[PDB]
Amino acid sequence: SFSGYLKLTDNVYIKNADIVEEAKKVKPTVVVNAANVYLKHGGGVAGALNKATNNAMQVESDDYIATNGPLKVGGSCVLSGHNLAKHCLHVVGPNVNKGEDIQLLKSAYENFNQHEVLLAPLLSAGIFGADPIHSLRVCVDTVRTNVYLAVFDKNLYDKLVSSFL
Numbered sequence: 001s002f003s004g005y006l007k008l009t010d011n012v013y014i015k016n017a018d019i020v021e022e023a024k025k026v027k028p029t030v031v032v033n034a035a036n037v038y039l040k041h042g043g044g045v046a047g048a049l050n051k052a053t054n055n056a057m058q059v060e061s062d063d064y065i066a067t068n069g070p071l072k073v074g075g076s077c078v079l080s081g082h083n084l085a086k087h088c089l090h091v092v093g094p095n096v097n098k099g100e101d102i103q104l105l106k107s108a109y110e111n112f113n114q115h116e117v118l119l120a121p122l123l124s125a126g127i128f129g130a131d132p133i134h135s136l137r138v139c140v141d142t143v144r145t146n147v148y149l150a151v152f153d154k155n156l157y158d159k160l161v162s163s164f165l
């Protein structure tokens with residue numbers, strides 16, 4: 001199962017790890033992708049997860065968008081986890097670099113409550129432009145299910161743990 005995670009709360013855990021390497025090792029029931037509304041997995045966590053699936057995630061995602069149209073900012077969809085997990089929960093946090101409403105971050109984390117346990121990144125952090133300290137706070141105050149957070153950046157991981165209230 002999950003190993004080397006620091007316990008932050010009753011249900012939130014955190015580790016300095018590459019979420020792709022964590023997914024390949026654990027093969028969790030659910031891996032969360034930091035998706036955009038189009039499911040275009042170009043960079044950040046999305047690009048890295050998609051590359052690990054040999055682009056199968058993108059092919060499946062393009063079929064999903066062709067059928068359903070785009071997701072909402074704050075929304076999600078469940079697709080296959082391919083070689084990484086049973087399922088991938090594609091969650092759209094607001095991208096502050098694209099001017100999206102940061103209040104939608106709580107709505108984005110509410111999607112995690114539909115799954116008992118998830119391997120996840122901090123939503124809207126990294127290339128999405130939001131403050132990761134704020135994202136962790138919203139995560140702990142919103143998610144009630146078991147979430148194992150993988151933070152790629154060591155320096156950010158140390159800052160998140162040391163500043164956690």
Ligand SMILES: CS(=O)(=O)Cc1nc2ccccc2[nH]1
Binds near residue numbers: 044126
């Ligand atoms: C696995 S990779 O694509 O070679 C490198 C990588 N790993 C990441 C984890 C989180 C965000 C971006 C990331 N880029």
